Design a protein around this ligand. Structure first.
Ligand code: MG
Ligand code: MG
Lengths: 248, 254
DNA sequence: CGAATTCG
DNA sequence: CGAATTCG
C-alpha cells in the first residue's frame, strides 16, 4: 500500500502565492503521501518546501524559472538516484524527472513531467509523451514504473501518439474511469484563472508499468478542492491523490 | 483572334480592398494590369463597393458579378463579347465569421461551357478548421458540376499545404494549375512580405494562398502558363495589393 | 482556455 | 505572418 499526490501547484501565479503554498502543504499534511510529484514549482516555493516538507527528500527538475519536483517521504522511501532527461525542443524548459527508489523490497522508477502546455504546442507535447513512454520501457522488468504529472494531454493526442503501449496503464482508466476525479483542470469549479468559459480537462495523469498484477491502483481522488481564506484555491489544477497496492 | 479562340485566360487576385489607403490609385494599378493582358475572366477577392465603381470606370469592358453587396466580397469579371453570362450561383459558408462564401458564375466562352468559381476562404492560421471546411465545400461543388461543364476555381484559399493534406488532398479529377505545370518557382508564392510592403510587416513570410483548381474530363483542359502579376510599385510607392495576382492561360481541347 | 491585441 | 501578451 503506497500513496502519492501529483499536483501542478501553479507557482507561476504570483497572487496569494504564499497563502496558496501553505494551503498546498495543509493538504499534503492531511494525507501524508509517500511521494509528492509537483509541477510549476518556482525557487522560493521550493525553498519553502525544503523547510515545510523537511520530512521529505526533495528532488528538483531545475533551479531557475519553474520546474518539477519529487518529494520522497523519509523512512518510507529510500532515494537511490535521480535522472533528468531533457526535452531537446521544449520552449517551456520542460524535462523528464525520474527517481529510482525503493519501498522496502520493491524497486520503483518514479517519473514526473510538466509536458508542453497549450493547444498550439500539441506536436511537441506528443513528442514529449513519446520520450516519456520510451523511458518507462527502459527500466528492468522487476522495477515498478510510475509516471505521474501534468501532461496537458488531450485524448486525441494520446491516440496520435499510437495509444499507450500494452504494458502501460492509465491509473484513472484502470479504476474504471471514475467521474468524481476525471477532470483535474476545471474552470467551472475552479476560479483561480478567472476564466469565464467552462473548460474541463484531464491534464494530470498517472501512467504505470508493472509485472502482471504487481501494481494495483486502489483509489484515486481529487485534492485541493477547498478555497483558502483569500477565496481562491491552492492551484488552478486539482491534485490527484492515488493509493496503490504492491502485490507479489 | 481565331488562333487564340481555343485559349481561356484569366487573372485571380486578392486586391486588398480592406486597405483603404491609396485604394483608388491601387485600383488603377490593378486595372492597368487587366488592360495589359486583357483576360477573358477576372476573379477578385476583397472587393468593396467603392472598388466596384473604380472597376466600372477603369475596367469598363468587364461585366461584374459580386459575392455580396456590402462590406467586402469577391467578384467575377467577364470580358464583354467574349463571355456569355448564363447564371450566378452563391453557396453560403454557414460558419464563416468573415462573410466568406462561394461565388459561381456559369458561362459559355470559345464554344465551351464553364462553371467559374471563386472564394476568399477564411483567413489566418487560427481559423484553419473553418477554412478546411470551406475548402471541402468548394471541392464538393466542383465535383457536383455536370461532367460536360468545365470547372475552374480560382481564388484566395489562404491554404497552408499541410491543410490540403489534412483535407485529404485534391480529389482525383481535380487538379491544381501550378502543380500541373510542374510547380514552377517563379509564381510559387502569391503573398510575400519580403517582396511586398503593403502591410508593413517587418518580417519575411511567403505563401501560396492564391490557387487555381480545375476539373476536366481527361485531357480536355490543359494549363498553358502561369505567371504572377502586380509586382510593380505604383506612384505611391506601394503595390496594388498585399497579394500578387495570378495570370493563367488554359487550352480547351477536344 | 482562447479571442483579441500588439510586436517585430 | 507568427510570436508574445493580455484578460475575462
Ligand atoms: Mg499552469
Ligand atoms: Mg487580405
Amino acid at each position: 500500500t503506497i500513496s502519492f499526490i501529483t499536483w501542478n501547484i501553479d507557482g507561476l501565479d504570483g497572487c496569494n502565492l504564499p497563502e496558496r503554498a501553505r494551503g498546498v502543504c495543509s493538504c499534503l499534511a492531511l494525507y501524508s503521501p509517500d511521494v509528492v510529484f509537483l509541477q510549476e514549482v518556482i525557487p522560493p516555493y521550493c525553498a519553502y518546501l525544503k523547510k515545510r516538507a523537511a520530512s521529505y527528500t526533495i528532488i528538483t527538475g531545475n533551479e531557475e524559472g519553474y520546474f518539477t519536483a519529487i518529494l520522497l517521504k523519509k523512512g518510507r522511501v529510500k532515494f537511490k538516484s535521480q535522472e533528468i532527461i531533457p526535452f531537446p525542443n521544449t520552449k517551456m524548459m520542460r524535462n523528464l524527472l525520474c527517481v529510482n527508489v525503493s519501498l522496502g523490497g520493491n524497486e520503483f522508477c518514479l517519473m514526473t513531467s510538466h509536458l508542453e502546455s497549450t493547444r498550439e504546442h500539441s506536436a511537441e507535447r506528443i513528442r514529449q509523451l513519446k520520450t516519456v513512454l520510451g523511458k518507462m520501457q527502459e527500466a528492468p522488468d522487476s522495477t515498478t514504473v510510475i509516471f505521474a504529472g501534468d501532461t496537458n494531454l488531450r485524448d486525441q493526442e494520446v491516440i496520435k501518439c499510437g495509444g499507450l503501449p500494452d504494458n502501460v496503464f492509465d491509473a484513472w482508466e484502470f479504476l474504471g474511469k471514475p467521474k468524481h476525479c476525471q477532470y483535474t483542470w476545471d474552470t467551472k469549479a475552479n476560479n483561480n484563472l478567472r476564466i469565464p468559459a467552462a473548460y474541463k480537462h484531464r491534464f494530470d495523469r498517472i501512467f504505470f508499468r508493472a509485472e502482471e498484477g504487481h501494481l494495483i491502483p486502489q483509489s484515486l481522488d481529487l485534492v485541493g478542492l477547498e478555497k483558502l481564506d483569500c477565496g481562491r484555491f491552492p492551484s488552478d489544477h486539482w491534485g490527484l491523490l492515488c493509493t496503490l497496492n504492491v502485490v507479489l
